[PDB]
Amino acid sequence: YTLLNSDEHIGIMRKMNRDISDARPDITHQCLLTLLDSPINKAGKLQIYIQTAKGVLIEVSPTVRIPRTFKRFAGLMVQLLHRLSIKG
Amino acid sequence: GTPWKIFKNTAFIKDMFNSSLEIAKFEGAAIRTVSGIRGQIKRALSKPE
Amino acid sequence: SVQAVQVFGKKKNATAVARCVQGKGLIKVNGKPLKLFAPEILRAKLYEPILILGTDKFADVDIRIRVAGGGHTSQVYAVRQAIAKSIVAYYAKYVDEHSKNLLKQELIQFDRSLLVADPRRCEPKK
Amino acid sequence: SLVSGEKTNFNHILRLLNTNVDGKQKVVYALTQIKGVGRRYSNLVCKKADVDLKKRAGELTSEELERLVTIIQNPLAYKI
C-alpha cells in the first residue's frame, strides 16, 4: 500500500501505456510544503483544500506540520485516504 | 425440558439443551408436551445459552 | 324547561363534549377553567372563537367541556371546535336565526375547521 | 480622589494544592478544576466552611482560602 508515483511504478504505467506523467503526488507534496511553510499560513490567513482525480476533496488544517519526506508523506496520505481522517 | 416464557403459541423452553450447537443439530425436531400438544423446535435462542 | 345544547367536537382521536346552558359566562374544561387547560402557547388557539365572536355573545352562556383521547394539539383543536359549534348551536335553538347566520358567517370567514371537522383520508396521487 | 481598591485585584490566577492554575470562575466551579474533585463533591465542601455559593474565587480572604485546603486533605475529619 503506497501512493502511485513515478518512482517505482514507472514500469507498470509504462507497460499499461497510460500517461506516465500524470501519477505524480510530488507536485501535491512540494506545493503543500510551500503553503504550510509560507508566512500567510503562520499568520493564520490561509485555508487549503486538495481535490484529487477520484473526486476526493481533502481539507488540510493550517495547524498541521506535514512530513517533509515523500515516503512518510505517502504513508500518511494512504492512511488518510483509507481512514478519512488523521488525528494528531 | 421446561417452559421459560409462554406466549400464545411460541414458548421458550429452558432446561433441555446446553448450547446453540445442540439446538442447531435438533432444529425442526418434533417436540411434545406431556398434555398432548405437539410442536416443533424452531430456532436457537441467543442470550440464555 | 331548561335551555341546554350538547355539541361534539372531533380531531384525530381527541373528542370533546360541550354542554351549553343558560348561565353567567363561565367556560370549564374537565372541571378546570379554560385559561388553565392547554399548553401555554395553544391557549391562543383556544381563545379563537371567543375573540372572533366577541365576548357579548358568550356573556349569557355557560359551557362545560369534557375531552378525551389525542395529544395536546388534538385536544386543543377539539376544544376550540366544541366551543365554536356549541355557541352556534345555542344561537340556532334559543335566539334568532339571523344571529345564528351571523355567527356562522364570521366563523366560516375565519376558519372552516371551527365548524366542520375535515378528517385526513388517504388518497395520494392515483 | 482616594477610594479603596482593596478588592479590585481579584481576576488573577490563584495557586492551590495540586493545580497551579485556578482563576476566578465561581466558588464551586473553581473546585472542579482540581483533579479528582467532582461536580457533586464540590457542593459538599462549601456547605461546611460557611462560604457562599454566590461568591467567586478570589473574593476570599487569606484565612478563608486555606480553610478549603485543609478540608480537601481529610474528608473524614469533617464528618462525611
Partner: protein, 186 residues
C-alpha cells in the same frame, strides 16, 4: 410606573425592587467588573459596561431573566458609563476609559458616532433633556474638562468648560438650560 432600580457593585449588578426593596435579581455574567447598570426608559433592558472593555446589553423581565441581546467589544479598554437616550429607545452613549465617548444604536454592530477631544479618562456623561436639545451630549473627564457635543457634526465639542479638579459627576437640569459639573470639593 415600575418597580425596578439597579445597583452595580463589583462584578455583578443587582436589580432591586422598589416596593419590596429586596434584591430581585443578581446578574453576574460579567468577567471583571460592571461599571454602570442602567436600564432603559421602557424598563426591560439593562446595559452595563465592564472593566475589560466590553459592554453587554441584556433583557430582564419582571423576574429572573438575563437573556443577552448584544455584546460590544470595541473599546478594548474599560467603559465607565453607558447611558440610554431619554427619548429614543435604541440609541445609547458610552464614555470609555481611554479618550472616547461614542454613540451606539442597538441593531447595529458598529458605533454610530465617535467623539474625541478629551485628554484623560472620561468617566461621567449624560444626554441633554429637552425638546430643542434633541441630540446634544455632555461628558466630563478627568482632564478637568466638561464638553458638550452636537451629535449632528462629529468634529469637536460645541462648548467646553475647564475646571480645576478631576470632574467626577455631571447632570443637566430638566429645563435643559443649566448643568451641574461636580469636580473636587465643589
Amino acid at each position: 410606573t415600575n418597580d425596578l432600580f439597579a445597583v452595580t457593585a463589583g462584578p455583578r449588578v443587582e436589580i432591586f425592587s422598589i416596593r419590596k426593596r429586596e434584591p430581585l435579581k443578581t446578574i453576574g455574567r460579567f468577567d471583571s467588573e460592571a461599571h454602570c447598570g442602567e436600564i432603559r426608559p421602557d424598563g426591560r433592558v439593562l446595559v452595563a459596561g465592564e472593566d475589560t472593555g466590553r459592554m453587554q446589553v441584556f433583557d430582564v423581565g419582571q423576574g429572573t431573566r438575563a437573556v443577552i441581546l448584544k455584546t460590544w467589544h470595541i473599546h478594548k479598554q474599560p467603559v465607565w458609563v453607558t447611558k440610554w437616550s431619554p427619548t429614543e429607545l435604541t440609541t445609547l452613549m458610552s464614555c470609555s476609559d481611554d479618550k472616547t465617548v461614542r454613540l451606539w444604536d442597538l441593531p447595529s454592530n458598529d458605533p454610530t458616532r465617535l467623539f474625541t477631544g478629551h485628554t484623560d479618562y472620561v468617566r461621567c456623561g449624560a444626554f441633554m433633556p429637552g425638546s430643542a436639545n434633541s441630540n446634544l451630549l455632555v461628558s466630563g473627564s478627568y482632564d478637568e474638562t466638561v464638553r458638550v457635543w452636537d451629535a449632528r457634526a462629529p468634529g469637536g465639542a460645541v462648548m467646553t468648560f475647564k475646571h480645576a479638579d478631576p470632574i467626577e459627576d455631571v447632570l443637566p437640569l430638566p429645563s435643559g438650560t443649566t448643568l451641574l459639573a461636580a469636580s473636587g470639593n465643589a
